[PDB]
Ligand SMILES: *[C@@H]1O[C@H](CO)[C@@H](O)[C@H](O)[C@H]1NC(C)=O
Ligand SMILES: *[C@@H]1O[C@H](CO)[C@@H](O)[C@H](O)[C@H]1NC(C)=O
C-alpha cells in the first residue's frame with residue numbers, strides 16, 4: 584500500500600496534517616497505531632524513517648496514522664495547558680480526532696488504539712497516555728521526556744523551549760512525576776495505558792537523565808518496582824527493566840545508542856498485544 588493524506592478529519596485545533604497507511608489486507612476490526620515524528624520532521628518523513636512499521640501493518644492488518652506538525656519547528660506541543668490536558672485542545676486533541684475519524688471510517692477496534700513516537704513524538708506519546716487514557720491502550724516512547732516536564736515552557740523545540748528538560752536538568756521525585764500525570768486529567772478515576780520507554784546512553788539531544796525521570800514517573804503511576812531485568816534484550820547493550828507483573832510498564836536503556844533509539848517493531852507490537 585501507500586501513504587495518503589486525509590484532508591478533513593474533523594475539528595483540528597492543532598492545525599495538524601493527517602496521513603494514513605491502510606494495508607491491502609486489513610483486519611475486520613483493525614487496530615490503529617499513531618506514529619509520531621520528531622522535531623524538524625514530518626509525517627511522510629517518519630513513514631520513511633521507521634521502515635519496519637508499514638510492513639508490520641501489512642502482516643498484521645492494523646492501520647497506521649501519521650500526524651504531522653507544521654508549527655514550532657515541526658515539533659509536538661507538549662507545553663501548553665491545552666495540549667497537556669484532557670479535552671484541552673492543540674496537537675493532542677487533533678491527534679485524538681484523527682483516531683476517532685479512523686475508527687469510524689475504517690470500523691476499527693477502539694480498544695486497540697496505540698501510539699509510538701521518537702523524541703518529540705515520544706514526548707507526545709506520553710502526553711497522549713496521561714491526558715487520553717480513555718483513548719489509548721498502550722504507548723511506546725523512544726528517546727523522550729517525562730510527561731509535564733515542559734509545562735509552561737515558551738515552546739517545545741530546540742529553538743523555543745526552556746532547555747532544562749532536554750539538557751537533563753529537571754529531576755523530580757516519583758511522587759512529583761505521578762502528580763504531573765494526574766494533572767493531565769484532574770479527577771480522572773481510571774487506569775492508564777501500558778507504557779514502554781526507550782533511551783540511549785549516548786543521546787546528545789535529549790539527555791538520558793530523562794530515562795530515569797520517566798522510570799520514576801510511570802513506576803509511581805502504576806505502583807510498581809523493578810522485578811526483573813534482561814540484559815542484551817532485545818539487542819546487545821539494551822537492558823530491559825520489567826516492573827511489577829510486567830503488565831503496565833517496561834523500560835529499555837541502550838548502551839552506546841544516541842538520538843534516537845531505533846524502533847524495535849517486535850518489542851513494541853508485542854507490548855501492544857498485536858503479535
Ligand atoms: C470520578 O469520580 C467522582 C466521584 O464522584 C466523580 O465526581 C467524577 O466526575 C469522576 N471523574 C470523571 C472524569 O468522570
Ligand atoms: C518498592 O520498593 C520500596 C523500597 O524498596 C518498598 O518500600 C515498596 O514496598 C516496594 N513496592 C512494591 C510494590 O514492591
Ligand SMILES: COc1cc(/C=C/C(=O)O)ccc1O
Nearest residue numbers: 621622702703740741744749
Ligand atoms: C535539544 O532540545 C530539544 C529537543 C527537542 C526535540 C528533538 C527531536 O524531536 O528530535 C525538544 C525540545 C528541546 O528543548
